[PDB]
Structure formats: C-alpha cells, structure tokens
TrEMBL record, chain D:
Subcellular compartments: Membrane; Plastid, Chloroplast thylakoid membrane
Keyword Transmembrane helix attached: yes
Binding annotation for chlorophyll a 1: A35, H53
Protein's recorded name: Photosystem I reaction center subunit XI
Any one annotated GO CC term: chloroplast thylakoid membrane
Gene3D superfamilies on file: Photosystem I PsaL, reaction centre subunit XI
Source species, domain of life: Eukaryota
Residues annotated as binding chlorophyll a 2: R37, E48
Main subcellular localisation: membrane
Family: Belongs to the PsaL family.
UniProtKB/TrEMBL annotation, chain E:
Binding site for chlorophyll a 36: M675, Y683
Amino acids binding chlorophyll a 30: F473, A474, H527
Residues engaged in binding chlorophyll a 25: Y367, H383, H384
Coiled-coil intervals: none
Binding site for chlorophyll a 26: R419, H423
Positions contributing to chlorophyll a 27 binding: H430
Binding site for chlorophyll a 9: Q106, W109, Q114
Documented EC number(s): 1.97.1.12
Name the UniProt record assigns to this protein: Photosystem I P700 chlorophyll a apoprotein A1
The organism of origin for this protein: Rhodomonas salina
Gene this protein is translated from: psaA
Automatic annotation (TrEMBL), chain F:
General function of this protein: PsaD can form complexes with ferredoxin and ferredoxin-oxidoreductase in photosystem I (PS I) reaction center.
Membrane topology reported for the UniProt record: Peripheral membrane protein
Protein name: Photosystem I reaction center subunit II
Location, primary (coarse class): plastid
Subcellular location: Plastid, Chloroplast thylakoid membrane
Domain of life: Eukaryota
Record carries keyword Plastid: yes
Any Pfam family matching the protein: PsaD
GO CC list: chloroplast thylakoid membrane; photosystem I reaction center
UniProtKB/TrEMBL annotation, chain G:
Subcellular location: Membrane; Plastid, Chloroplast thylakoid membrane
Pfam families: PSI_PSAK
Protein name, as recorded: Photosystem I reaction center subunit PsaK
Gene3D superfamilies: Photosystem I PsaK, reaction centre
Annotated TM spans: 11-30
GO cellular component, one term: chloroplast thylakoid membrane
InterPro entries: PSI_centre_PsaK_sf, PSI_PsaG/PsaK, PSI_PsaK, PSI_PsaK_bact
Main location: membrane
Organism: Rhodomonas salina
SUPFAM superfamilies per record: Photosystem I reaction center subunit X, PsaK
Record keywords, A-Z: Chloroplast, Membrane, Photosynthesis, Photosystem I, Plastid, Thylakoid, Transmembrane, Transmembrane helix
Membrane topology category: Multi-pass membrane protein
Amino acid sequence: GDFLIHHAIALALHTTTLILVKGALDARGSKLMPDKKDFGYAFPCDGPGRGGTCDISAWDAFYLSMFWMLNTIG
Amino acid sequence: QSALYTHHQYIAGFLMVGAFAHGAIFFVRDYDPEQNKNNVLARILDHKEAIISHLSWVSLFLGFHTLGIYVHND
Amino acid sequence: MFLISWRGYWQELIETLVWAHERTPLANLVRWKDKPVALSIVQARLVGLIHFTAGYIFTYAAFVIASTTGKFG
Amino acid sequence: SQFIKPYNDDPFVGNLATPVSTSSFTKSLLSNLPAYRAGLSPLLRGVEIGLTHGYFLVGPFYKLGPLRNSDVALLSGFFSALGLIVILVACLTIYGVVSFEETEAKDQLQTAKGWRQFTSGWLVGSVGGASFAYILISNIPFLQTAGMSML
Amino acid sequence: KKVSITVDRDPVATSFEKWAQPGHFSRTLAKGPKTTTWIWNLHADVHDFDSHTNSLEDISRKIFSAHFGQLSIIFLWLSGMYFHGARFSNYSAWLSNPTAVKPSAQVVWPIVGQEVLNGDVGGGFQGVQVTSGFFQIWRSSGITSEVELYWCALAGLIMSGLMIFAGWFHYHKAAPKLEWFQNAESMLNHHLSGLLGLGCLSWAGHQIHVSLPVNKLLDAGVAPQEIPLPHEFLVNRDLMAQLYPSFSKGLVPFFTLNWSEYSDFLTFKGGLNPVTGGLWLSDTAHHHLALAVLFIVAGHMYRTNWGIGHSMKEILEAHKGPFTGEGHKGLYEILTTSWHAQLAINLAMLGSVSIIVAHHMYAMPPYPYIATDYPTQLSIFTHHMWIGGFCVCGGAAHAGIFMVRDYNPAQNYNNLLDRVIRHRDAIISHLNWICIFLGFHSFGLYIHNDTMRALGRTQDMFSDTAIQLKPVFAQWVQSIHTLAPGNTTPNALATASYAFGGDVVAVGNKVAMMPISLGTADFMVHHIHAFTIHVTVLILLKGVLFSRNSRLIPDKANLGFRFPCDGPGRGGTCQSSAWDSVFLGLFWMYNCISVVIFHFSWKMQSDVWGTVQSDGTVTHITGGNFAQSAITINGWLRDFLWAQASQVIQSYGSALSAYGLIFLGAHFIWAFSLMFLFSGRGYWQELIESIVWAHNKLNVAPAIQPRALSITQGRAVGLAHYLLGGIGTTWAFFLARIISVG
Amino acid sequence: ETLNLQIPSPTFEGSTGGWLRAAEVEEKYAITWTSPKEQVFEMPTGGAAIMRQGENLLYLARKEQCLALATQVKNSFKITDYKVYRIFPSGEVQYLHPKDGVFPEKVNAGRVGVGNVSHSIGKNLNPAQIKFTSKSFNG
Amino acid sequence: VPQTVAWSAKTGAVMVLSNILCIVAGRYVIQVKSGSFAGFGLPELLASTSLGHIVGSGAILGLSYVGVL
Amino acid sequence: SHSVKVYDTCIGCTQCVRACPCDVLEMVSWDGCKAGQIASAPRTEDCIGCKRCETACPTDFLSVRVYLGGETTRSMGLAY
Ligand code: CLA
Ligand code: CLA
Ligand code: CLA
Ligand code: CLA
Ligand code: CLA
Ligand code: CLA
Ligand SMILES: CC1=CCCC(C)(C)[C@H]1/C=C/C(C)=C/C=C/C(C)=C/C=C/C=C(C)/C=C/C=C(C)/C=C/C1=C(C)CCCC1(C)C
Ligand SMILES: CC1=C(C/C=C(\C)CCC[C@H](C)CCC[C@H](C)CCCC(C)C)C(=O)c2ccccc2C1=O
Ligand code: SF4
Ligand code: SF4
Ligand code: SF4
C-alpha cells in the first residue's frame, strides 16, 4: 500500500510540475501565442480565434496546477 | 501530530506552487534573452519542449500504471 | 460555480437586474456609483480557485481534527 | 384594444407601458407614496417612510427572535429593530456622502442636503415607529400573542 | 382531397460510396481532415440535418428515416429483453414465488473471477439481479411461460427488421414530399385516433381477454402451468364466463348501451389488489378502454379532406386578446416549417410525461408484485426522473436552436414570440428574483437548521418539534383524496393511491404502499424542488430569450446557436451562446433531479418501505429518521449518504461488487470531467505542442495535426463525463443499497 | 450633415431591451438609414420592428448595437445609406460611421494610419527590456 | 355502480333524438361543407351521427344514472 | 481603452475591418503590401476587445493585435 501511494504521490508531484513547468517555460510564448510576453502574466485569453485560447496564460497554468497541488497534498 | 503534519504539508504545496508561479512571472517580466545568451536559463528555454514532453511522459507513465494497478486490485 | 459557469451568462443576468432596478419604483431612488458588471474571466478563475481551495482546506481540517479527536487513536 | 403600449410614447426606451406599470391605480399609488409625493419635504418624506418601516420591523424580531420565548422578548425585539435602524441609517448616511455632490438645493432626495434631511427623518420616524409598536404590543395582550389570544 | 400522399420514387441510390467518404454530408467536412478537430466536427454535426441542406424536404426525409432507425433499435432492444427473459432468466421460478425470488435476466460468463456477479437471486438460479420491472410487466401481460417470451422476442426481432427496412425504403425508394410532412391535422388525427386510440383499444382488449383471466387465475393460487393458454379464453366463452359472468351475455350489453353488465371486468375499484400490491387490472382495462374512446374521439377534431374538422391555423389566429397583440398568429407557420420548434415542444412534453410517470408509478403501482420489489420501484422512479430531466433540457436546447435559426422577425411581428422577446428582461429579472428568494427561503432554512442544531439550539430550528413549517395545502389535498371515495368520486371503492391516506397495503409482509405523511422536512425539500426547478428554468429560458441578441452581444444570431464566446472583450463573453445555457442548465437539471431522487429514496425507505410486523406495525428500512434529520444538511450527509452508502462500500466479494466498482468508477469519471470543466483549450494546445515536438523529434508526427478539443467541445465533454459520473455514482449507490435492504 | 432630430422612427411596439439611465446621462447612439420599403427587421435590443419607407431614426445604447442593425440592414435589405451618430446628453451630435463618407473597408485619401508598427510582431521588445523605463515595447 | 338498463324503445328514443339534434346542429355549425338540401354530403351526415351517438350514449348513461331512463 | 496595433506584415485583405463590430479599424494607403493598403485603428476608444479582427487575420501571426487595457463604459460593452 505504501508503494502504491508513493507512486501516486510521484504522479502528483510530476503532474503539478508539468503544469507549472509548462506555464513557466511557455510563459513568454508558444506556437498558439508567440507574443504571450507582450500580454503579461495574467490575461484572460487571446480570444476564440486560432481554435480557442482559454487558459493560455502562465497564470492559468498556476491556476490549473493549484488543483493538482491540492490533490497531491490530499 | 495530524494537524501539524497536514498544516505544514499544505503550506509546503502552496510555497512550491508559488515558486513556480514566480518563475513564470520572472520569465514574463524580468528575463532578458540578450542579457542571458546561451546561459543555463536560455538553454532551459531552448529545450523547453524536451523538458515538458518528458514531464508529460513520466506523468502519463506513472498515472497509467499506478491507477491501473490500483484498479486491478479493486 | 465560478469554474464551470463563465462570464457571458452572468453579464446577461446582471443586465436584466440593472433593468429591473432602474424600472422598479421606490428602488430607483437608490443608484449605484459603480456599474454592476460580471466578474472578469481571470477574476472568476481566481474566485473559484479560492473557494475550491478554502473548501478543500476547511473540509480536510475538520476531518483530520474531528476524526482524530473523536477516535483518540 | 391594446393594454400594453411603448413607455412614455418612446418605443426605444428600455421599458414598456403595461397595466401593472402604467395604470391610473399604479400612478395614483406611487404619487400618493411619500417617496414620490409632490409637495412633501425630504425630511417629511423620511419621517413617513421611517414611521412605517420602524413600526413593522419590531414584530419579526419580537416574535421570531432568540429571546422570543422569554418575557423580555419585546425589549429584545425593539432593541434588535433599533440596532437594525442604526445600521440602516448608517447605510443611508454613507450612500448620501458618496452619491451626491454637495449642492445648495435641498428640495429633492437626490441632493446631498436632501438625502441628509431624508436620513434624519427616517431615523426619527423609525425610532418613533419602533417605539409605537413597542407601546402598542406591550399594552395590548392580543398583539403579544400571534392572534391566538381569542383561542 | 388536398391531403394526399406524394412521394418521390428512387430519390437516393443505395450505394456504399458515401460510407467510404466520411464527412460527405457537409461541404466543410467533405474535403477531408487537416486537424483532429475535423474528427470531432464529424460526429458533432452529423444529425444536424438543417446545417447540411437548405431544403426542408430533404431534412424531413432524413428525420423520418432516422426515426425508423431509432424504432428499429428500440425493437431490437425490446426483443433482447424478451430473449434474456426467455433464456437467461428465473422468470418461471419468479412466477411461482414472486415475493421470495429476485428478478434476474442477466448471467455473466466466468472469465476473470467476474462470475461472483451471478449471485443467488433465488429459484435455483444464479445471475445479475435486474430492476427494470420486466418480470412484473410480463406477469401483468399474462405471459406465464418462457416459450411465449421467445415468441415476443421474435415479434420484436421482426418489428426491428421491418423498421430498418422501412427507414431504408422511405429514404431510398419512396421518400415522401414536403407537402406530405406538412399535414399536421392528418398526423394529429392519426396519432390520436390511430396510434394512441387503437393502441389503448387493442391493449384494453388484450387486458380483458388475456391479462384479466390469467391474473385472476394467478391470484386465485393456480400454478402457472395449470393455467389455460390465452387463446382458450378467446374460444371457450363458457370458461371465460366462469371467471367473469358478464361474458355469458357477450357484446349485446356493449351495443345496446347496457354497460353496467360489464362491471365484473371493467371496474372502478381504485386502490391496490391486496394479493399483489398492484393496481386492479380490471381498473386498468377500464382505464385503457376509456382513454381509447377519448383519444379516438379527439382524433376527429382536425380537418383533413372532408369539410368537418378544425383548421389549427384558425384556432391559433382566433386566440388573441388585449394583452397579447396579434396573439398566436404565425405559430402554425412555425410549427409546420421548423422541426426544432416541434422538437422543443415534444421534448419538453415527453420529459414532463416521464416525470409524471415516475410519480404516478411509485404512488399507484401498476404491475403485480412491483410495489414490494423495492429495487424495481427505486430504479424505475430514478430512471424516469432522469429521462424526464434530460428531455426537458433538450426541449430548451431546441427552443434555442429554433430561435437562432428558424426564427424570422418578418413573419413574427407583434405575435406571442415577438412580445416575449420584447419583455425578456422583465421575464428573466423576475425569474432571477424568484430564484434568489427561493434559494434563500429553502436552502437557507437548511443552513439555519444546521447552525441551530450545531449551536445546541434545537428549539430554534425549523422542525416538527420546533418552529413548524407545515405543508398545510399538501396535507389538505391529501385529506381531500382520502375523503374522495364515496364523496366526490362516489362510485370509487378505494382511494386513487394509498399515499394520500388510508390503509397500509402489505404483500409478503413487505409494504406495498402506505400513507406518505408530510411534515416540516417535506415542506423544506419541496421548496428545494421548486427552487432547483426555477433555477433550471431561469438558465434554459435566459438562453432561449437571449439566443439571438443581448445588450452584451447585439448580433448573437450571426455567431450561431453554439459558439464558445465572442472574445475576452466587453469584460469577457465566455459562454454567451444558447448552447452554453443548455450546458449550464443540464448541471442544474442534474442538481434538481438528484435532490428529487434523494428525497424519494430517503422518504420511501424512512416512511413507506419496510416490513409489516404483527399488529400491523411497520418497521421501516431506515426507521423513520427522515422527519428529524432531513431538516439539516448534516442529516442528509450523515443519515442518508453516509448511512446508506454502506452497501456500495461493503459490496466487495459479493454479487453487488459490480456496484462498488461502478460507484468508484463513476466517482473517477465525475472527477475526470472537472479536468475538462475547469480548464481551457489554450493550455492543452501548448501542451500538445510540446508532445508534437517529441513526435517530430522521432519523425512520428501525424498528418492529421493534433489539436486540443474546441472550447465548446471541452465544455460538452466535461458535462458528459460529469453527468455520467454523478448519475453512475447515484445509480450504483441506489442499486446496491436497495438490492441489499429492499 | 447634422442629425435632423425630426426623422421619423421605425414602428416598434417597445421593449425592455432598450436604453437605460446611462443613455440620458452619459451617451446615446443614433442610427439613420433610408429604406425603399415598409419592411420588418429585427431590433438588436429585442424583437421585431418595421422600418418605414423613406428615412428612419433609431436610439440605441451602444455603438455595437447601431453597427449590428447596420449589418442586418446591409445584408438583408441592402441599405448602404446608414449613418451612425453619438449623441451626448449635452445635446452635441457626433457623427461616427462611416467617418469620412467612405466605408472603412475601402481605402480613402487623407486617412492617416494609426497604430501601425513598422516591424513584424516577433520583433517586439521583451518586457524586461522595457521594465523601469518609459520606452514602449513596440521597438 | 351506476344503474344501466337493457335496450328498450326509450333508449331508442334518446338515440334517435340525439342523432336528429346533431343533424340539425351540423347543418347550422359545420363551417366547411333548402335547409338540409343544400351542401349536405356523406361526411357531414357521418360526422353528425357520430356526435349523435357520442351525445346519445352520454345522455343514455346519464339518464340511466339518475333514474330518468 | 484597448490598444490595437497593425504590423507591417498586413497584406491589406480588409477582413479585420469587416469583422470589426465597432468601426475601430479602417484602410489607409500603404505601399508595403501588394494590395496598396494597410489597416489602421483611429478609433480604439470604441474597441470592445472582441478580437474578431484577430480571427479574420489570415497572416501567420495576426498583423492586427488587440491588447486589452483600461476599461471604460464603451470598452466594457455596457448599455447602462
Ligand atoms: C439489444 C439488446 C441486447 C443487449 C444489451 C444484450 C446484451 C447481451 N447479450 Mg443478448 N441478445 C439480444 C439483445 C441484446 N443482448 C438479442 C436480440 C438476441 C437474439 C439474437 C440475443 C441473444 C443472446 C444470446 C444467445 C446470448 C446473449 C448474450 C449477451 C451478453 C453478451 C453478448 C456478447 O458478449 O456479445 C459479444 C459478441 C461479439 C461477437 C463481440 C462483439 C464485437 C464486435 C466487433 C461488435 C462490433 C459491432 C460493429 C462494430 C458495429 C458496426 C458493424 C460494421 C459493419 C461496422 C450481453 C449481456 C450472451 C449471454 O447472456 O450469455 C449468458 C448469450 O449467450 N444474447
Ligand atoms: C393511424 C395511422 C398511423 C399510425 C399508427 C402511425 C404511427 C406512427 N407514426 Mg405516423 N403518420 C400517419 C399515420 C399514422 N402514424 C399519417 C397519416 C402521417 C402523414 C401526415 C404520418 C406521419 C408521420 C411522421 C412524419 C412521423 C410519424 C411517426 C410515427 C411513429 C411514432 C413513434 C411511435 O410511437 O411508434 C411506436 C409505436 C408503435 C405502435 C410501433 C408500431 C409501428 C407500426 C407502423 C404501427 C401500425 C402497425 C399496424 C397499423 C397495426 C396493425 C394491427 C394488426 C396486428 C391487427 C408511429 C409508428 C414518426 C416516426 O417515428 O416515424 C417512423 C414520424 O416522424 N408519422
Ligand atoms: C479523477 C480525476 C482526474 C484524472 C484521472 C485526471 C487525469 C489526468 N490529468 Mg487531469 N485534472 C483533473 C482531474 C483528473 N485528471 C482536475 C479536476 C483538474 C483541474 C482542472 C485537472 C487538471 C489537469 C491539468 C492541467 C493537467 C492534467 C493532467 C492529467 C493527466 C495526469 C496523469 C497522466 O499524465 O496520465 C494518467 C492518465 C490517465 C489517468 C488516463 C486514464 C486512462 C483511461 C481511463 C484508459 C481507459 C480506456 C477505456 C477503454 C475508455 C472507455 C471509454 C468508452 C467510451 C469506450 C491525466 C490525463 C496533465 C496531463 O495531461 O499531463 C500529460 C495536465 O497537464 N489534469
Ligand atoms: C428526441 C430527442 C432528440 C433529438 C432528435 C435530437 C437531435 C439533435 N440534437 Mg438535441 N438534445 C436532446 C434530444 C434530442 N436531440 C436532449 C435530450 C438534450 C439534452 C442533453 C439535447 C441537447 C442538445 C444540444 C445541446 C445540442 C443538440 C443537437 C442536436 C442535433 C445534432 C446532434 C448530433 O449530431 O449529435 C450526434 C450524437 C452524439 C455526438 C452522441 C454523443 C452524446 C453523448 C456523449 C453519448 C452518450 C453515451 C451514453 C448515453 C453514455 C455513455 C456510456 C459510457 C459508459 C460508454 C440534432 C438536431 C446539437 C446541434 O447540432 O444543434 C443543432 C446541439 O448543439 N441537442
Ligand atoms: C453549493 C454550491 C453553490 C451555491 C451555494 C450556489 C449559489 C447560487 N447559484 Mg450556483 N452553481 C453551482 C454551485 C452553487 N451555486 C455550480 C456547481 C454550478 C455549476 C454549473 C452553478 C451554476 C449556477 C448558474 C448557472 C446559476 C446559479 C445560480 C445560483 C444562485 C441561486 C439563487 C439563490 O439561491 O440565491 C440564494 C443564495 C444562496 C443559496 C447561497 C447560499 C447562502 C446561504 C443561504 C446563507 C447566506 C450566508 C450569508 C450571506 C452570510 C452573510 C455574512 C457573511 C457575508 C459574513 C446562488 C447565488 C443562479 C443565479 O445566480 O440566478 C439566480 C443561476 O442562474 N448557479
Ligand atoms: C503508434 C504510434 C505512436 C508512436 C510511435 C508514438 C510515439 C510517442 N508518443 Mg504517442 N500518441 C499516439 C501514437 C503514437 N505515439 C496517439 C495515437 C496518441 C493519442 C492518444 C498519442 C499521445 C501521446 C501523448 C499524450 C504522449 C505521447 C508520447 C510519445 C513519445 C513517448 C513514447 C511513449 O511513451 O508513447 C506513449 C503513448 C501514448 C501515451 C499513447 C499510445 C497511443 C496508442 C497506443 C498508439 C496508437 C496506435 C496506432 C493507431 C497505430 C496504427 C498504425 C496501424 C494502422 C499500422 C513518443 C514520441 C509522450 C511524449 O511526448 O513523451 C516524450 C506523451 O506525453 N503520445
Ligand atoms: C520555474 C522557474 C523558472 C526560472 C526561475 C526559477 C524560480 C528558479 C524556476 C523555479 C524552479 C523551481 C521551483 C525549482 C524547484 C527545485 C527543487 C524543489 C529542487 C529540489 C532539490 C532537492 C534536492 C537536489 C535534494 C537532494 C538530496 C540529496 C542529494 C540527498 C542525498 C543523501 C543524503 C545527503 C542523506 C541520505 C542519503 C542520500 C540520498 C545520499
Ligand atoms: C484534457 C483536455 C483536453 C485534451 C483532450 C484531448 C486532446 C482528447 C484526446 C483524448 C484521446 C486522444 C481520445 C479519447 C478517447 C477516450 C479513451 C475515449 C473517448 C470516447 C469517445 C471519444 C469515442 C482539451 O483539449 C480541452 C479543451 C478545452 C477544455 C478542457 C480540455 C481538457 O481538459
Ligand atoms: S471563452 Fe475561452 S476564449 Fe472565448 S473568451 Fe472566454 S476565455 Fe477567452
Ligand atoms: S486582416 Fe490582418 S491582414 Fe487582412 S487587413 Fe486586417 S490586418 Fe491586414
Ligand atoms: S477587437 Fe473587436 S472591436 Fe476592437 S478592433 Fe478588433 S474587432 Fe474591432
């Protein structure tokens, strides 16, 4: 049981890091929004064009990783 | 003992998520690529996709198997 | 509620409430100084995150303290 | 025969003239009510509205309050009504301060002086109406009960 | 003869060529995928026929043949239920001992240890216990044999083949023209008279000649193989006249109008059969005969080809008063040229009828031995509540699609639609106020009771022992229905339902039905119901009324029914479509129906269901804890969810372990939905960019470029998993609980 | 050029979606157009109105409300004769659209480009460069 | 149970009366079709006798219920 | 108000101006592209920030770029 839960915590620490690292590394730009830096850290989206850009900011990857932090400390 | 452990682990998850948040804020607001040419920081951004895709792999790896073993057991 | 339901629905509710307040007698004597708007997209993500997180903390703190106190073991 | 028409003979205004909104009965009631009554001072407007509101506030606090089963139920209900009056009069005061720029004219509620006169009247009326309710309920046994004194 | 049959012969060629070209039905999708969004866009718009073709004739033809395909699927499904009853069931064992044997029509294969699901349901049988109430239907039909269930399975199979043939024939060989479909008078005449009326008449005839003799013999105590076959009642009129002596006179009392001779088998008894705890089938036979007469009579209202009848256009255009402008003018044109307007009405009605079905079927159990089969009662109530709620939200979905697409202001000047859209702010603001008032004054009473009970102030609560919010109107209506036999329904012998008051009906020492008293807890949970229904109406109505335009987006109809937003500007217009109000109202429907089924489950276990002890005492399943504990949220958490989730959690290693697995699996799916609900597309597209890089690095990038799901599809996937997870959690919890304890 | 306040308005039975107190205290928008017919259109604020043959005048609370009617009148009834004005509570009438008599989608002489950036979007300065200095991020 | 009777000439009288009442009513009130020799078709007759049987049956069952028979 | 910028990668397709619901953008003469015209934003005070102009932009990176800024009654889309 300890083994299985430790692996669950490994998935949680790696997944929270994935979201946070993806937010930090793609903070300044991505293929979806190359000039993301020009908009700041916390902006809503870039609109419904280019397929849809909801939760595209680096703040929004903070936001999404906060659930994964709560899940892992849970 | 239960309250102290739970309290400090929740504080731990908040501080760790905030550290990655302010690394994202650092990249957006304070990171100058010209002043940081070919550094450890520039070269981390250069392979940002290798880092993020391997975090995606290890997250998926652990999640599929840990959940699968748990579901197998259930 | 803040994380699933998003702004356009709420701004359309609020515009009907703005209409109703301006059209209600004895109540249109009282006027807002700031125009009531729906919360922003980022603000509502933050408000839902705060509510989610606070609910998470308060639920678990109540459980981890009461189950251990009530059991003593 | 059509009973619903555009409001104020303006179609693009955001209202519809309807029987509920624009009957002569509705117009008479609104004009008769102190807030919209013509010829009424802002202080007098506040006194009439306050007397009404303070009078009916006492009853829910008295009958349904925490101290309802006690013999001090009316005193608790009056004090709770009075506390609510003081909180509301603070709300009226702060709204008046922020909403209205100071102007010399006081003949209207929608003026700094007029809303201050209205708040003054509302406090005097609300404390008086609450007091009137206290005096009446204390004197009359039927009011002390919920109407079950006959039973 | 302006009502005529007109068909184009051989319209569409039966070819496999379009099967081999996915996306053929739309100009956008037929050029092939370039991104994975195409794949999703294929399934999302397939049945959206009026998005592919301009002509109403081809749309109507596609709808008619798709309805035959659906009927083919329903008949195949029914044929399978009859075959599983014939072959993999303990139906014959259940017929002999209905009160001890548990219905089961599903047997699992032994593969991975899953054969533990073949539990001991009784009758020398192992299988999965089934709760659909088919055994009670078949006993009500008078089947009494597995051979006849094989013949019903073949009849369903033949009907399934005939419907799939008819869909092919009516799309590819003889497709009706638009002027055929635009015969609402003819269709209503035939669906009232022919479909519903001869449906009731034929079913009443079957009940009188098959269900009534077989069920009289079954309740007399005759074993199923000692009962004469159903045609021997048709021929031996002497044998039928033994059970019902009115058959000695035949059809002379019917035609001579001496109908009181038929009171042996056409009764108005009311109440329940004491032997089975179900409705008297003589009442059901009279019920269906009376409905048949009115349905056939109703289907003569409209004018078709002979001058008698109503024009529905004339009926609608004549109903206009001083408040409503031109009145119902233009509504006939809407409802014979817009399929979505018809689907909005018919889905709201079919959902309302399914909700009515759940209340009436629990209160007046219509099948023999269904009332004391508590897993079936809970299952069919919960099922028809969910089908009802889903269909009601689809009525609002297609009201939104009508408003966005088929609404034309030119043909709708100053009629009822124009006037509703022209005071939609007053409608939505008053609905908004009533929902705030009713959330405060229903759920805030629960918060008051939580607070007072937590504070030690039990004298300050809304409860039967404290401040009593009694439901005086509901109690008064219950009084009237208990006094109704012999007073306001003089020829009734018993009440319409024992829920209103009266006797306790017990079958096999288990309560079939008994009075459902209403107290403070019932007042509170009914105003919870009124609140959740009001808010679901507010979201769905706000979406219908603001589908075309708002003060926010003045040209919302140009963006369509289903668009994600119109950008982050104007403060943000996320979820501004009518689709997104269907999306938000399906959550509130879920909330509403979840509280309804929770109220039903707890109230029936606490105050209705249970065992009848000596002296007529009824020991209920949860021992009458609803009255003093359904007034607080902690009571619902503790005495309902925690107390009754014992069976799902402790189901492992038993036959109900599948329910424990589905309980956990649906908790998983529900949580998994929140990944799609709380997140946005832009995160997932940038994450997919990094994964695409890892594929590019290994030269394994796909040519159909992977995309994150659309904003709307992320919402739809989140809602679909949320509904599946929540409903599956409740499904597993309800079924393991009531199979164990009821 | 100036708004003729006497222009008759389309036949609308009224609605609750129209303008509120901010129209009479902050700004109101007006749209005029010439119609060849007595035809029904859809209001941006609600139901259906009838535009009169000849010249029509509307009072809306938003410029997008005015431009939404302008597109409905241009795509369904082919009216290209629409002029959009912003009317201040002071009584000042500000002509808005089309601003110089020619639609924005058509080039016109004497238009000076505003907002035009001489380089492409990837040559924008990084935020660290423009931090703690007034210099703009567009180069 | 309501008291109904075997068929007699009185039942026939009620049926005949109700049928004729509906023939005359159908001549007056059917909007789409010599008081009875103008525009009288089989559908009109069939519809009116259909209602005459409905009305007649309702009348017979009610008059049997109350005792008038 | 919002700030709306047009970059010199604009091909003068006129689509962003047509998309504009608030008459923010217009076409001015420019010799940079084959079409002889570039988009301009002399009315960003009416810009609601809908970003419909960005959707209509066929350049690989939108030449028209809306940067949401200070909110006003006009840029909030408030009819009240
Ligand atoms: C419509 C309702 C319905 C439902 C839900 C079921 C459900 C079931 N049946 Mg019943 N059955 C039905 C109708 C139904 N049946 C009817 C109408 C008949 C009469 C013909 C039967 C006769 C029947 C028998 C005789 C038996 C069952 C059995 C079973 C069980 C397993 C079946 C299985 O694993 O097949 C799996 C079989 C496969 C070949 C695997 C399917 C894989 C392929 C790829 C399916 C894909 C479909 C295809 C892709 C669609 C596109 C077509 C193509 C051109 C693209 C399961 C409980 C068994 C049972 O209960 O044992 C105890 C059993 O022995 N059924
Ligand atoms: C009295 C004649 C009659 C009857 C019985 C029906 C019956 C039906 N019609 Mg309707 N229809 C009629 C006349 C009739 N129609 C006319 C005149 C028109 C032209 C205006 C239409 C136009 C029409 C349209 C446009 C649509 C229907 C649809 C339907 C189906 C509704 C779904 C349902 O509940 O089926 C389940 C109930 C059943 C009873 C299934 C049985 C199927 C058969 C066809 C019933 C009759 C069998 C036969 C007459 C019985 C013989 C008895 C014998 C054993 C003694 C149903 C089969 C809808 C549908 O689903 O399309 C397929 C639909 O879209 N019909
Ligand atoms: C129970 C709830 C739940 C589950 C299972 C997941 C699962 C996952 N999340 Mg999500 N998430 C959730 C809740 C959940 N999330 C919530 C509430 C939030 C807050 C918004 C998030 C926010 C979030 C973000 C922001 C990110 C994730 C990521 C991930 C992945 C992390 C584990 C992984 O990489 O591989 C584990 C994989 C699985 C657990 C998938 C299960 C395997 C399936 C079930 C196989 C079953 C096949 C079966 C036949 C299907 C039947 C279908 C039927 C119709 C035929 C995974 C897809 C990260 C990611 O994608 O990293 C790559 C990521 O970036 N999640
Ligand atoms: C008689 C009922 C009926 C009919 C004929 C239609 C018909 C239509 N609807 Mg309506 N609708 C209905 C009921 C109905 N719907 C109900 C009850 C709801 C409420 C949920 C809706 C909500 C609704 C919305 C919100 C929308 C439609 C749309 C559509 C159109 C195309 C849909 C399509 O291509 O999907 C193809 C089918 C699918 C994609 C199936 C996927 C659906 C779920 C996820 C599958 C369920 C799986 C299973 C039940 C559970 C999973 C089990 C798991 C363990 C394996 C079409 C006009 C859409 C449209 O285009 O508008 C014009 C649209 O936007 N409808
Ligand atoms: C349990 C969580 C929860 C709660 C409390 C609410 C609360 C509300 N929702 Mg939301 N909603 C939720 C979850 C929740 N929702 C979720 C999960 C979804 C997913 C889709 C939605 C989607 C949604 C939509 C789409 C709509 C609502 C609406 C509403 C309102 C209903 C009107 C009402 O009851 O006012 C009464 C208020 C309450 C019941 C809140 C609880 C307050 C209790 C009674 C005590 C009050 C405490 C008091 C103020 C203390 C003061 C002191 C303190 C400040 C110091 C209300 C604001 C509707 C709305 O706003 O229009 C009316 C609406 O249209 N909700
Ligand atoms: C067989 C084809 C194929 C191959 C060689 C790869 C190769 C790779 N993928 Mg995978 N991937 C594929 C299909 C494939 N992908 C599909 C179809 C999907 C959609 C579900 C994904 C989703 C996916 C994600 C989300 C991730 C990868 C990752 C990776 C990399 C790590 C290897 C790994 O752990 O795989 C992991 C594989 C999966 C998680 C999904 C497996 C999907 C199935 C099993 C394969 C499909 C079979 C296909 C239909 C074969 C048809 C060919 C036939 C007609 C002859 C590597 C570049 C990871 C990465 O970037 O890390 C460096 C990562 O995070 N892939
Ligand atoms: C995102 C972001 C952007 C840029 C800016 C930024 C803020 C910097 C950044 C954030 C980055 C962040 C948030 C980074 C977070 C980084 C973290 C949390 C690093 C954790 C490091 C722990 C180590 C190396 C433990 C070593 C233990 C050892 C060797 C034990 C050894 C042992 C001993 C002695 C005893 C036992 C035996 C053994 C096992 C042998
Ligand atoms: C995870 C996730 C994705 C990524 C999810 C993707 C790309 C779906 C791909 C899943 C694989 C590729 C197929 C899924 C197959 C499942 C095993 C079963 C599917 C059953 C039906 C599809 C047939 C989004 O694109 C998204 C968009 C908007 C809001 C939230 C989200 C979101 O949460
Ligand atoms: S929906 Fe996604 S994209 Fe459209 S506005 Fe809200 S966030 Fe920006
Ligand atoms: S759309 Fe992009 S390219 Fe076409 S004109 Fe406007 S800016 Fe220039
Ligand atoms: S954002 Fe909407 S309004 Fe501002 S410019 Fe682009 S299109 Fe015109």
